[PDB]
Amino acid sequence: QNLKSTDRAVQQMLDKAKREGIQTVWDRYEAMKPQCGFGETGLCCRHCLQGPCRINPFGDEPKVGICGATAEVIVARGLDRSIAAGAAGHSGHAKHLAHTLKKAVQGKAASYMIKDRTKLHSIAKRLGIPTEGQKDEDIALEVAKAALADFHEKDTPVLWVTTVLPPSRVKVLSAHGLIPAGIDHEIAEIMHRTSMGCDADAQNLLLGGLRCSLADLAGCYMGTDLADILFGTPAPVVTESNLGVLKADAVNVAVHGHNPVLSDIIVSVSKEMENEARAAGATGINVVGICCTGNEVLMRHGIPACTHSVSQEMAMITGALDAMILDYQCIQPSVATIAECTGTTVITTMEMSKITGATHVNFAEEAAVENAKQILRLAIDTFKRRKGKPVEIPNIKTKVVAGFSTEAIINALSKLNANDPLKPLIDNVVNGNIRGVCLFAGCNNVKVPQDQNFTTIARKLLKQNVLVVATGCGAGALMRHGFMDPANVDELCGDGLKAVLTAIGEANGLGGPLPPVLHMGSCVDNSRAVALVAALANRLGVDLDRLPVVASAAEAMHEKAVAIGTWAVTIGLPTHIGVLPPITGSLPVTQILTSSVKDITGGYFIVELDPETAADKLLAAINERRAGLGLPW
Amino acid sequence: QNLKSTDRAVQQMLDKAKREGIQTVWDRYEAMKPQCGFGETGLCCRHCLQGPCRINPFGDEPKVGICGATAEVIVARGLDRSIAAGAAGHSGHAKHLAHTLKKAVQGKAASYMIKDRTKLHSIAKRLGIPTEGQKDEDIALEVAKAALADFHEKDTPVLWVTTVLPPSRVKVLSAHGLIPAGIDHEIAEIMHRTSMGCDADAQNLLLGGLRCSLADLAGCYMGTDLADILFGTPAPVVTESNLGVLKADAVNVAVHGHNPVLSDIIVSVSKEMENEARAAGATGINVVGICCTGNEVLMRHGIPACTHSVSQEMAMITGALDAMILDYQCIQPSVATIAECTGTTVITTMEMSKITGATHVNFAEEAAVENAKQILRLAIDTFKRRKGKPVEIPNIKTKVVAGFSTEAIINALSKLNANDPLKPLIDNVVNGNIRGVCLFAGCNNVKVPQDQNFTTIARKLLKQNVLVVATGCGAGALMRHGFMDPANVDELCGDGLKAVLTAIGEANGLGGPLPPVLHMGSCVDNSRAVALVAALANRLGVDLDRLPVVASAAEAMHEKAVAIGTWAVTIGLPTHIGVLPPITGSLPVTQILTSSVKDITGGYFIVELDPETAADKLLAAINERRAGLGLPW
Numbered sequence A, B: 001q002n003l004k005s006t007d008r009a010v011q012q013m014l015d016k017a018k019r020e021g022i023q024t025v026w027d028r029y030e031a032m033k034p035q036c037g038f039g040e041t042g043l044c045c046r047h048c049l050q051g052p053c054r055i056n057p058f059g060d061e062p063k064v065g066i067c068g069a070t071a072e073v074i075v076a077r078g079l080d081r082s083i084a085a086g087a088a089g090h091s092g093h094a095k096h097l098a099h100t101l102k103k104a105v106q107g108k109a110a111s112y113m114i115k116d117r118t119k120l121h122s123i124a125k126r127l128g129i130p131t132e133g134q135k136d137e138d139i140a141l142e143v144a145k146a147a148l149a150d151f152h153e154k155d156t157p158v159l160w161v162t163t164v165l166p167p168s169r170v171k172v173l174s175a176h177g178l179i180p181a182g183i184d185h186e187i188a189e190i191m192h193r194t195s196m197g198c199d200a201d202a203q204n205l206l207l208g209g210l211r212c213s214l215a216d217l218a219g220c221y222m223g224t225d226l227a228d229i230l231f232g233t234p235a236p237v238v239t240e241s242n243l244g245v246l247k248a249d250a251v252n253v254a255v256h257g258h259n260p261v262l263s264d265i266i267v268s269v270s271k272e273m274e275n276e277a278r279a280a281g282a283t284g285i286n287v288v289g290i291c292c293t294g295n296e297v298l299m300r301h302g303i304p305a306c307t308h309s310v311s312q313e314m315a316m317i318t319g320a321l322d323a324m325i326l327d328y329q330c331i332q333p334s335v336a337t338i339a340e341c342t343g344t345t346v347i348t349t350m351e352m353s354k355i356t357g358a359t360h361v362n363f364a365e366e367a368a369v370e371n372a373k374q375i376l377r378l379a380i381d382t383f384k385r386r387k388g389k390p391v392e393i394p395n396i397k398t399k400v401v402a403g404f405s406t407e408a409i410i411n412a413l414s415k416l417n418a419n420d421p422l423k424p425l426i427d428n429v430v431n432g433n434i435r436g437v438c439l440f441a442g443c444n445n446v447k448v449p450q451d452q453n454f455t456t457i458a459r460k461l462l463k464q465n466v467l468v469v470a471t472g473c474g475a476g477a478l479m480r481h482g483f484m485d486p487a488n489v490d491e492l493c494g495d496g497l498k499a500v501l502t503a504i505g506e507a508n509g510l511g512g513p514l515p516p517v518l519h520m521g522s523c524v525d526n527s528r529a530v531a532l533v534a535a536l537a538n539r540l541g542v543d544l545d546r547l548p549v550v551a552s553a554a555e556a557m558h559e560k561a562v563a564i565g566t567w568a569v570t571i572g573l574p575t576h577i578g579v580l581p582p583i584t585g586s587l588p589v590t591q592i593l594t595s596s597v598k599d600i601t602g603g604y605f606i607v608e609l610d611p612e613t614a615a616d617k618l619l620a621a622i623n624e625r626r627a628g629l630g631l632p633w
């Protein structure tokens, strides 16, 4: 089972699934092999009813699609549609929070409110919205209107791009026509241009993709901004992760998906019903996180994270998971059928994301507390039904220090230099105690033994004094393996990095270092890493393609991850991907994405499936940036 | 060659291509066989980097996608993305015309103007925009603003749906949640909900698809509305079709694509340069149409149609095609490589639709006349270069009477009943002289011998007294086979239909009947058939699912055609498709689309590849509607 997952709690659950005859994601993968090589390489098109068209990677015919579409065009069109689908997810999440904020301040949903007034005014100021002499609710109405306006064409481009990157970066992107005109506008234009008999030039297509990836970045940033206004900006928190956070004697409720609009409320209401839970024979309600909505409540409230991504079914296999409360994205629909075998109640809540066989509760922000109580009562009923059933919760968990929003990082650094908080970080980049910065992002993928690439790459980077930050299921992988426990700094970190983490930790009244890896939050919170990097760029007076900063989607899966990697390249970062995107069927497309894009944006993809080799490539990219700044390396 | 195309001019060009070694669409199809059965049946997913996933239609594993996605979910997600891509094309076309109108009336593009003032005021009145005491340019500004506002969420739903269908139909659709909130909003929501780990209930997914198809309908209707304001509403015209409209002694210039914003201008400027062309040794500039932009200039100006869809390369094979001027959609990218062999200059004009190897001219509405002259001068240069080269233009053409906008049809009927123009049509439906109405729409598809289904079905329907209307490449097929020549009424039409066509024709001072089939225009002009059918519904006080009206996408290809067929079903029509959409891998999805949707919208798909059988099925659907109205059949 260590060939399927490097997580020992997952391995124990895979044994239980096997002996109980419950099919898992790994079993469904094995049944899919050998997978189609045309699709793996990108050399398949279904964009019209003349298809499917395929192109042999090598050999004889077919060499071209029926309409004349070349391998270059077919690969670039497929990739662009993946970018657009990722942008649609992140920006659908942001749009939902924009509507929630509007309703809150219009008096339509009093379970929601402005919790971070300071963040609200800073966002308004960034967008140019006047705050002097205005009520908070009017400022917020204007912020929510601005958010919604970025989805369509107007007299300004997308402000959640142009106001969040350095002017010099905006200017480079504008010169190549890459600034998005509106988020949903770009998604639709990608769908148009990639339909049959439209765009058929690989460079043109891929420039469209870069622009659409910036619409994804805007959605991410808008989502983080709005969630912080509504739910609070994260600050350092301590909690736990892995399946041992489940408790046999409690009602275990997992929040799963991405958008915390419902699950932030579940967290609050769950505490009101501790007595209702005690009356049903439980110790209380134990809310735990899966995937990114789990990250959201971990970062803001310290809710422990049960599991992530590819291993999500395993939480059910314990027999102790009484409810799994779903919104959207990254939820394996297998959970609805597994729940018949495990005695979990799987509940959907969003109109556009239902799963046959799950119970649907039509969550409305206007009724949020009511809906939360209905859902929690279903989970209490389910707890009662398992009275006397044995469960098998692996007694495996890690300690997690998290909550490192960019504001939190700046505040922690300010204890070393109050009026120039980024300077201590920069000083230690220059002196070599911090070699550079690597962001780990994205999913697990069944093709890769779970967490193997994240942990292998991270270990090598940390020994080489790289400051490692993480989000999403990259953060999940690292937290489940101990990389968010400061007790592991001595074992994992190079001496320079250890010195820096220790100095910041001690200056923040911890008597110990910051953790080895800094958890910056959910997938939309990749935007927080952008904020940090853009602030460093501003403080140094350079663009992001000169900073020693890289990204790694070391085990990517979702279309969202393809969008994030593409905008990481578009904003100027060397960006590793550790699973093969469907591009290898076209050498010209591969060469654009891994080489000639450097001449447009300064970033580039590093496609490398071997994690030891990927780490060496990422260190080489960091060290080239250091050399370009005249620094030793 | 009659196995590839039933058009004899096409067959002659296929022989020339063969002897010259020029590969065609049919050759590229043959090289693709056997095509992938997983993609043909819809049982393939590439929505994440764990894929590709496939499901065997029958037999053993794989039976389910890696994430747990069932055959039902995979098929419904693929179909929804096709609908969204079609909506993106039609609505991208409409959005471009909205921006053009705005620029015209703001004084930024004086090659464009309000040509149909009456249509402008009727549209404004339909949308609720005040006209009394307003300047035309201000009314039009408000119309263009309304058009752009329908792309995003606002306080009203999409007005180019809710204002164009009967209230009773709007009410049915609203009750099922199917009215779109914004065109690009729906496209993006489809992309979101169909991404990995989101919507996974076939009924829910397909309801989303129906709603997105109504966003496509809105784009179509908005496109026709704006094009009529800018370029004039069609009225009856006589011209010719097929490759014999090319002239060896003239500069032959094809306009090809969909959006007439540029090609309406090409038509005007071409007449100014007749002397510049004569000086280069040509008789003049012979503008001819391909595909839908050809339909647009055919309907408004009588420009002859050269060819359509699958046979577009054949116009180049003659050796006489000096330029092919491209905008977007349905252009085989093979044209850019064929042009090296044929001596045609292929010119792209739109930033989002380029083809490697073609010459790009960056058309701007503000510079339209200038750009047109640059493009026509390239075509004149190309004519000169073929001085003395033999060409082979098949001496094959048909006469075409066209220009039957809904306004034109109402006006023609008004000659039989001035104050109740729809009543003569209804009287003849009731008395059986007109059995019902069939709209032919969509593309040719290389899988079907070109035009065979359109002409086989149309012949059977016309003998059974069905009023046949057509758009797009369905109109192209029918025009190239003589179905728009009134001289063919005696041979093709039943006695009842002949009597009606003759009475309307004679009352319109023609001394002869209307043509056998009424050409209602381009693909967006399917919206004109909706206007006609909705007006008939309003006049009868019933909804569209009670009228004896059907649709047939008899040879469909493009994602756009899938969107149109889906909205035809959603507005209440029995809708035939004569090529297999990728649905047969899921019986539950097939049953929804061909049967249980009747209970939601009253329409339904009829999937039938055999055209004789399809005609019988369409007649049965018409006759069931007649019976539901208490009429003989």
Ligand code: SF4
Binding pocket: A045, A046, A047, A048, A049, A050, A051, A052, A053, A065, A066, A067, A068, A069, A074, A195, A196, A197
């Ligand atoms: S768009 Fe071209 S390559 Fe794709 S399926 Fe259609 S014919 Fe084949």
Ligand code: SF4
Binding pocket: B045, B046, B047, B048, B049, B050, B051, B052, B053, B065, B066, B067, B068, B069, B074, B195, B196, B197
């Ligand atoms: S979304 Fe599911 S079915 Fe599709 S490729 Fe990914 S794992 Fe396979």
Ligand code: FES
Binding pocket: A036, A037, A038, A039, A040, A044, A045, A052, A054, B036, B039, B044, B046, B052
């Ligand atoms: S041929 Fe397998 S993905 Fe299309």
Ligand code: FES
Binding pocket: A036, A039, A044, A046, A052, B036, B037, B038, B039, B040, B044, B045, B052, B054
């Ligand atoms: S397996 Fe052929 S279309 Fe995917």
Ligand SMILES: [Fe+2]
Binding pocket: A258, A291, A292, A330, A472, A473, A523
């Ligand atoms: Fe996520």
Ligand SMILES: [Fe+2]
Binding pocket: B258, B291, B292, B330, B472, B473, B523
């Ligand atoms: Fe068309």
Ligand SMILES: [Fe+3]
Binding pocket: A291, A329, A330, A443, A473, A558
């Ligand atoms: Fe995910």
Ligand SMILES: [Fe+3]
Binding pocket: A442, A443, A472, A473, A523, A558, A560, A561
């Ligand atoms: Fe993610």
Ligand SMILES: [Fe+3]
Binding pocket: A330, A442, A443, A444, A472, A473, A557, A558, A561
């Ligand atoms: Fe992910």
Ligand SMILES: [Fe+3]
Binding pocket: A291, A292, A308, A309, A330, A442, A443, A444, A472, A473
């Ligand atoms: Fe994830």
Ligand SMILES: [Fe+3]
Binding pocket: B291, B329, B330, B443, B473, B558
């Ligand atoms: Fe077409």
Ligand SMILES: [Fe+3]
Binding pocket: B442, B443, B472, B473, B523, B558, B560, B561
């Ligand atoms: Fe069409």
Ligand SMILES: [Fe+3]
Binding pocket: B330, B442, B443, B444, B472, B473, B557, B558, B561
């Ligand atoms: Fe078509």
Ligand SMILES: [Fe+3]
Binding pocket: B291, B292, B308, B309, B330, B442, B443, B444, B472, B473
């Ligand atoms: Fe067409």
Ligand SMILES: [S]
Binding pocket: A257, A291, A292, A309, A329, A330, A472, A473
């Ligand atoms: S996730």
Ligand SMILES: [S]
Binding pocket: A292, A441, A442, A443, A471, A472, A473, A474, A523
């Ligand atoms: S993620």
